[PDB]
Amino acid sequence: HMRHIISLLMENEAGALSRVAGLFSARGYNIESLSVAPTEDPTLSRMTLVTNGPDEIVEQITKQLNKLIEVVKLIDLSSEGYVERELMLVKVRAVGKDREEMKRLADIFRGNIIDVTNELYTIELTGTRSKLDGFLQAVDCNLILEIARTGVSGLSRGERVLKL
């Protein structure tokens, strides 16, 4: 039951994504998080999807995904060197001494405050999964007003590219 980061190229067209999400849904496959946006080439979008399972489940999801005509290339990004980043926006209640505390946490995690009132901050964070998770462990939950978190975006290390 471990994390695989699936990376795929697909037809930037209507239904493309609803069909990819439908394939998971039909069979109750987990989607932890999902990023998709156009590439260099506007006919093709790049999707980064994170799923949680034993290998034999992932290999079957991977088998089924390749079968879709709108899925063009596909790699388990996790099976080779890669880099990943996520972006997160955390809106936090920040009054009295918690104003200093929230500012210290932002600086420690190298985030930036991008919205501010007398009683709140919106903090922008970028990093690996664990950095962003470490931020959330470190903040008191009762302070969090809401969170918007982009889901992982990754690339293979070095010369390896998905389109080739």
Per-residue binding letters, 56-95, with Ca ion (x by CB under 5 A): ---------------x------------------------
Closest by CA position to 108, among listed 84, 139, 129, 147: 139
- List the structure tokens of 154: 């990754």
CB of 154 closer than 8 Å to CB of 80:
no
Q: Least distance (Å) from Ca ion to the CB of residue 76? A: 15
When the beta carbons of 17 and 57 are compared against a copy of itself, the nearer one is 17
When the beta carbons of 66 and 112 are compared against a copy of itself, the nearer one is 112
- Establish if 117 lies at the interface with a copy of itself (CB under 8 A): yes
β-strand partners of 84: 154
Residue 58 and residue 66: Cα distance in Å, rounded? Answer: 12
Phi, psi of 79 (to 5 degrees): -85, 10
State the residues that interact with a copy of itself by CB under 8 A: 7, 12-19, 21-22, 24-26, 28-40, 46, 48, 83, 85-89, 91, 114-115, 117, 119-120, 122, 124, 126, 136, 141, 144-155, 157-159, 161-163
